[PDB]
Amino acid sequence: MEKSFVITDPRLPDNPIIFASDGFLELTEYSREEILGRNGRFLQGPETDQATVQKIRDAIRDQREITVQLINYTKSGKKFXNLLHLQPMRDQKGELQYFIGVQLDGEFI
Numbered sequence: 665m666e667k668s669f670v671i672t673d674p675r676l677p678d679n680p681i682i683f684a685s686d687g688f689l690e691l692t693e694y695s696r697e698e699i700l701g702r703n704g705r706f707l708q709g710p711e712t713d714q715a716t717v718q719k720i721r722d723a724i725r726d727q728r729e730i731t732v733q734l735i736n737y738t739k740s741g742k743k744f745x746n747l748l749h750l751q752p753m754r755d756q757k758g759e760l761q762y763f764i765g766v767q768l769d770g771e772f773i
């Protein structure tokens with residue numbers, strides 16, 4: 665599959681997605697119109713582990729890189745195990761500019 669990633673802007677309210685790769689559209693079944701401007705949490709559902717979601721919150725708070733695995737859902741409701749890579753990206757002034765989130769689909773341990 666093509667590379668699945670989104671880029672968020674934490675200088676906007678609730679860190680919305682401002683770019684979604686074609687691979688992300690493919691992986692999640694959503695259209696670019698249905699993704700842009702929302703927080704990445706929209707992929708979570710009932711089976712998503714809340715301890716892992718907390719770990720994500722904390723990494724985003726402390727602006728630190730993290731890799732977690734967690735259950736997400738496609739538009740039509742299919743489960744998929746998301747090995748999610750989050751990385752802060754700072755400008756040359758050392759100010760947080762974006763977050764990049766890269767998803768790999770599958771059961772990875």
Ligand SMILES: Cc1cc2nc3c(=O)[nH]c(=O)nc-3n(C[C@H](O)[C@H](O)[C@H](O)COP(=O)(O)O)c2cc1C
Pocket residue numbers: 670671672679703704705706707708717718720721724734736746748750763764765766767
């Ligand atoms: C760039 C980026 C990509 C993200 N991608 C995903 C994702 O693919 N799946 C997911 O469940 N959460 C993803 N998140 C996590 C949620 O956006 C959110 O940070 C997490 O649920 C914790 O915050 P909350 O407790 O307010 O929901 C991503 C966050 C960022 C910054």
Ligand SMILES: [Cl-]
Pocket residue numbers: 678679703704724
């Ligand atoms: Cl967030």
Ligand SMILES: [Mg+2]
Pocket residue numbers: 705717
């Ligand atoms: Mg939540």
